[PDB]
Structure formats: C-alpha cells, structure tokens
Symmetry: C3
C-alpha cells in the first residue's frame, strides 16, 4: 500500500507542476521566478517520493524515510521564498529577510534528520532546536514579513495573510506528526504517519501555490 500511495503522490506532483507551467505561459503580472519556484517544489518532492515508491528512499535503524528530508531540505525553503516574494509583491525585495528564513528552514529539516537518527534525550535536543527554528520562522511570518506585505497595500496584504495562515497551519502539523509517530513517542501507527506525510504535502506542495498564484494573478488588471 505504501508503494502505491507514493506513486500516486508523484503523479499528483507532476500534474501540479504542469498546471503551474501552463499558468506561467499567460503570467498576468506574476514574475517568471515565482512560477519556477512553484514548479521546482512539486517536481523535487515528486522525485524524492518516487524513490520511496521504488523502495529506495528508506532504510532500517524502525524505518527511516530519509527521502522525506532530501525532499524538505529543498522544497520547504523554496515554499518560504515563495511566501516572502508574495509579501514583497509590488515593492522592493528584502533578500536578507528571505535568506534568514531559508537558513532557519534548512537548519530545521537537518535537526529533524539528525533527531530521527538519534535515540533518547539526544533525539529531543535536536527536535527542540528544530521547533525553536519553526517558532522564529512563524514570528518573522506574522511579524516583520507581514509588515512588508502591509507596506505593499491592503489587497496584497489580504492575500499574503491568507497564504501565510494556510502554510503556517500545515507547518505545525509536520513536527506534531513526527513527534507522535515512530520517529518520536511512537503513539501513532506507521501507516497513519505514512498517510499524513502523503496528504499534508499535497496541500503544501501543490495546494499552497494554487492559492498563492491565483491570488497574485487576481491582482492583475488586464
């Protein structure tokens, strides 16, 4: 079942990527960079999850789905970049703030991988550092990054706030699932975790960019 679920995921990623490419052909005031980001996220996640489908992106230590971390270390920082560019739409870009988020995010995923490879107190030290990174990301998202959004007008700010809440809601789910699942306290069955890390990603990897791009495109007056 696990194999089939991952094959299906990879196919949905491919479909999402194609949709964003088609949108890119009639961009409606949205820079090409934002379409490229939107496309890379699902395509990369697709490849990683395909490796799991083929029975390659995991090993025994319990089952460590290391392919997930290879996925997130690229996809999650790109998702943050997309959100940041949305905040900066119609204004001057703050790449310092953007790369601040990328750095925090990459560290977050790495702590997760190390934590998964760790046992006892060591595991939860790394997990904890990752959670601290996530909190700082959330503070930036609803603090200085939102103030940039507000500096770019009512309509843009309204869209940013919507996508910020969307992504933030999914963000908190991942570390919650991790902790409850076999990687953490082991309260949740492996199959449950597998389904959670199939469904969430669909909403984060494709869902987010659909909401984001449509909202931005709507700001265009042709």
């Amino acid at each position: 079942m696990i194999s089939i679920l991952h094959y299906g995921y990879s196919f949905i990623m491919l479909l999402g990527a194609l949709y964003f490419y088609l949108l890119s052909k009639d961009p409606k005031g949205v820079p090409a960079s934002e379409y490229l980001i939107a496309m890379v996220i699902p395509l990369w996640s697709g490849a990683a999850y395909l490796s799991i489908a083929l029975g390659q992106g995991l090993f025994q230590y319990t089952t460590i789905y290391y392919a997930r971390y290879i996925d997130w270390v690229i996809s999650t920082p790109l998702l943050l970049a997309a959100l940041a560019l949305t905040a900066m739409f119609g204004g001057k870009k703050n790449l310092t703030l953007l790369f601040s988020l990328v750095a925090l995010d990459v560290f977050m995923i790495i702590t997760g991988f190390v934590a998964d490879l760790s046992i006892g107190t060591t595991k939860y030290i790394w997990y904890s550092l990752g959670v601290i990174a996530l909190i700082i990301i959330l503070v930036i998202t609803f603090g200085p990054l939102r103030r940039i959004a507000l500096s770019n007008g009512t309509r843009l700010a309204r869209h940013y706030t919507r996508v910020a809440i969307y992504l933030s809601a999914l963000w908190v789910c991942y570390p919650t699932a991790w902790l409850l699942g076999p990687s953490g306290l082991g309260l949740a069955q492996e199959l449950t975790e597998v389904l959670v890390f199939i469904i969430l990603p669909i909403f984060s990897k494709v869902g987010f960019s659909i909401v984001d791009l449509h909202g931005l495109r709507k700001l265009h007056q042709s």
Copy 2:
C-alpha cells in the same frame, strides 16, 4: 593505465584554468564572472579526477562506481549551462530565472544518473529516463527561448552562441549514450573504453568549450 589517464586529465584541467586566468587579466569586454565560471569548471573537474587517479573517487557495487564523476558533474555541468546562458545574454539584459531553470534541470539530471548507477533492473532505467527527459528540456530551452535571447543581442553574438550551443549539445548527448552502453547500463562497451570516453569528452567540454566561448566573445570587443 586508468590512474595515469586521470593524472594527465587533471594536468590539462590545471593548464586550461591558468590559460583562462591569463585571458581574464586582459578581459576585452568579457565580464569577470564569465572568466571565474571558465576557471572553476576545469579546476573542480581536475580535483575530482585527481581523487580517481589516487584511487579514492570510486568503490565496488559487482562493478566499479566512479562516484567522483558525479561530484564533478553536479558542479561543472550547471556552471557550463550558466556560461552558455550568459553568452546568449551578452550585451543585453540577463534572465537569471531562465539561467537557474537550466541549473535546476541539470543538477536533477546528474543526481538521476548517480541514483541510476546505484540502482538495478527497471529502477535503474526509470532514473536514467528521468535524466534523459531533463536533458531534452535543456536542449529545447537551449535551441528555443535561450537562442531567441541570443538573436535579440545581434547577428554576430547569435552566430557565436549557435556555434557554442551546437558544440556543447553534441558533447551533452554523448555522456548519456556512453553511460547506457557501458558497465553502468547495458554493459555492451568494455570498462576501459568508457574510462577513455569519460577522459576525452570532458577535455572538449571542460576546456574546449570555454576556449571557443571566450575567444568568440573577446572577438566581439573589436
């Protein structure tokens, strides 16, 4: 013989790099960034191939994986594409989105090759196939939108770009052909043959390309 061939390669890379450094001292209208790219490519490939020469950059899997090649290509090949892209954009506005589109496709391509090499049966050829699809999309961009940018920068620049585009594209298709025929693929070609092919081709791609490229661009100065 394999060790000696790699030592010789590394020496040629060193010579090529030094030549490009000398050219950089009297740049003739070519930005410093394009000389830096030209220098990093051979120097990086040189180091990687030196590791093989020393008997480090390979392991047994029951064939020999020259993993040092993938370490080389994951850096050298995206830089080669960047160089080609900047050539197209010479004298005009740069499209970094298109450039990083090519880098992304290229890095993915090399990774699929590494995974394919570590894979067996149908799994190997799935990854190989994904890499081939990336290469095709790179070729479509190179002779499509990227060439149209070249054409927008004048007849003389376009003529040069088309020349270097065909040069690199010719070498590009050789690598996946050799891979498939050689021990990593169908195993029709002898290991020594593959070793020689992945010594000779790189010399034309890592040094040859930049010689042709830089000379052509420098010639546009007068």
Copy 3:
C-alpha cells in the same frame, strides 16, 4: 573532558549570536545582511560542535578520531567569514560579488581538501593538504591585494578598519592548517587533547571575536 569543552563552546556561540542580534536592532549604518552573516557563523558552528559534545559528530578511522563535524562547520562558517571580510572592503561602495564568490569557491575547496586529507593516509593525505594550503595562499593574495585596493577606494577610515580585520582573520587562518598538521590528523606531534583545545579556542576568536571587532569598527564609521 572533550564533551564538556564542546558544550561550553556551543554556549559561547549562542551568547555571541544573541549579542550580534541585539547590535542588529540598532544597526548604525551597517546593512542587515552583515548582521545576518555575523549571526549564522556562530549559530552553525555551535550546532556542529554540539553534535561533537553529544558524541555524534566524530568517528574512528586509522585507529584515530575524525571530528568530521568540524568540516561540516567550516564548509559554511569560513566562506561566510570571507563574505563578511569582502563586504567590509566594499562598505560605502559598489559590490564586487565576482571577487566575493571567487573567495567562497577557494574557501569551500580548502575545507573539502582538509576533510579528504583527514580520510587519507601517507603521500595522498599531504597532496590534499597541499592543495588546501595553495587555496589559502590565493585567498591571502586576494585579501591583501585586489580586495584591499577596493577597501582603499572606500576611504582612509574604512581601509584602516579593513586592514585590521584582514590581519586578525589572516593570523587565525594560518593557525588552523598549522594545528591540523601538528595534531593527530597530520604528523601527530601534539596530543589529541592539545588539538581539541586549539580547535575550541581559535574558533571563539574567529567565530565571535572577528565579528565583534568587524561590527564595532563599521558601527564607529556611522555619523549620528
């Protein structure tokens, strides 16, 4: 012993990072990017050294201990330190990102040669070490050559500051490969504990010390 030393280091890194964050809140004409760089360096080094403290960032090889977490640290921290130095030279002027990424490239290569050298034995080890030393020399030539000339182009006061931080960092730079060569990774003249202490103390001066000197000097140039 070794574990406790690394825990202490990680705490000092955290304190340094917090200090730079506080400075960033009242920037005094120093761009945000330079505060971000100043913060990432110690935070990253802290995390890496914490892994050693926990007994994860090291393994046995050649019957000796490879502290591989050091290389994970340096491959990120050392290029950021060079970027910081380069941006200092370019303070008040046009950026030369080509020169900057030239230094990053040389630096990343340098650290990698060190890792490979540490995994190597006999003549192979010292070939890699040698390639790393050549990279360091080219970095020093750039630092006191073209990069200093950029500093000079940005006025007497900035140039004076750059020269000071350039000498500071360059002095620490030569120490690392000297310690490596003398320690178990090289000739094995120095005991493991001696090397461990050197690669605890130097980093404190490089990862925190440098940015304290650098940021204070730059902030001083601010008129208000």
